[PDB]
Amino acid sequence: SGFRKMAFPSGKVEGCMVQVTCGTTTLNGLWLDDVVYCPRAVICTSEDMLNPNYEDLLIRKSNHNFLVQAGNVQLRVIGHSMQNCVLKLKVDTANPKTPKYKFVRIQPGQTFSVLACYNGSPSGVYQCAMRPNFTIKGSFLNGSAGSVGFNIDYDCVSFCYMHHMELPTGVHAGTDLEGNFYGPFVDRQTAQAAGTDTTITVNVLAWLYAAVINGDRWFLNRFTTTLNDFNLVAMKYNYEPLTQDHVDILGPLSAQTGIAVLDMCASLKELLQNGMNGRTILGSALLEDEFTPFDVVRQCSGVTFQ
């Protein structure tokens, strides 16, 4: 028992991180097979960033202007292209540490692990969620762009996020590995603001099931509710509307605990309306929404990876 915000083991991704330098700018790249992926903002100076014309900036860049460093070895760039907001730098050496991998575009509400890197070297790993407003609440400094987010299933790494930029309120925005931003954000230094930070209702419910599994039961009340009545109360609290699809996804946790999802919704409703009275649930004083139902099952059943 116990329950922690748990990241995936990062070894498979650590062997893919390199440093990419162009002009006066450095960030991280992802080296898979003979291609290095990195944010296209590596070609910008600080003044470029207010209003960059990336296609025009790229005209003055050749293969040899991209300095790619894996440890103390320089990779040889034999081609480059821009796809949306990422650059793909073809190198003449396949990464011998390339894992089995896929590129996926995740849905809001899904979670992943971030390997925060600087100068191609890892600083740490932590778990994040793609928020409903398409930001993530990460921990990133200057030089962290190009760090990636990922999931693992069995032996296959699904890359879903590459870091680009920081927004007001200290949250972060980036792209999938095809270079398309999550949400409406653009890689330029303009006034951009996250929308409403909506709470991922299905994840809070998953975490309440995790609490029950661990013996933290004080919040189970004597009530049930309906989907429509729950959403009426939760809309006021900026919770995502709960759908039947969400209820079905919670089926495994409901069957394990014997608690119908709508019963748990009634308990959540009272927590939203009356607060937690200074009590804690799984060591937390607020309702945690960055565990998916799959995250809970994984951690409570000991799912491992190869």
Partner: peptide
């Protein structure tokens, strides 16, 4: 706020 692209300066 403006968005800040979190590249780093070349050393």
């Amino acid at each position: 706020t403006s968005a800040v692209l979190q590249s780093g300066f070349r050393k």
